[PDB]
Amino acid sequence: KLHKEPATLIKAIDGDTVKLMYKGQPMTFRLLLVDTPETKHPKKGVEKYGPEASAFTKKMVENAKKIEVEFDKGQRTDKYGRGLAYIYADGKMVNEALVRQGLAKVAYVYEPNNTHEQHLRKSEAQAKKEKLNIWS
């Protein structure tokens, strides 16, 4: 079973990345299962909706009373050393919130790090149905 652990916000970096203090160590976390338009894309730089997704994540984590990270059942860090997790702001999953607002698409999922995949695909279907942002 997955479990939530407390973390402290250091700084929001992009729509899909946030720097947190986890167990006394500064770490960069990459939001699991979502692809957000970027402002720091290696090849493109700032993409359409990138500023929006970036501001949404920033607002959500900065205004939260409690931030929690939830690792999946597979590897906990990617090749760049970023923690791979589901981030919660006052009980609300940031990963899902972005998808629900049409500010992120469900990424190519890598089992076993796919626990909340169906949940996110459902939110994406709704955002698309409502033609929100990315889907407008």
78 annotated to bind ligand: no
- Here the CATH number for the domain that contains residue 63 is 2.40.50.90
Classify each residue of 15-52 as buried b or exposed e, where b means 16 or more C-beta atoms within 10 Å of its C-beta: bbbbebebeeeebbbbbbbbbbbbbeeeeeeeeebbeb
Catalytic residues: 30, 38, 82
How many independent structural domains does the chain possess? 1
115 among annotated binding-site residues? no
* Residues spanned by the domain of 49: 1-136
Contacts of 30 (CB under 8 A, 6+ apart): 16, 17, 78, 80, 82, 83, 84
Resolution given for this structure, in angstroms: 1.9
Nearest to 121 by CA among 86, 96, 87, 94: 96
Q: Which two three-digit tokens encode residue 123?
A: 């939110």
Method by which the coordinates were obtained: X-ray
Is 90 annotated in a binding site? The answer is no
C-alpha R_g of the chain: 14
Q: Give the H or E element holding residue 89.
A: strand 83-89
In which element (H, E) is residue 17 found?
strand 17-22
Distance of CA 48 to the CA centre of its chain: 18
Evaluate whether 53 touches 15 at the Cβ level (below 8 Å). Answer: yes
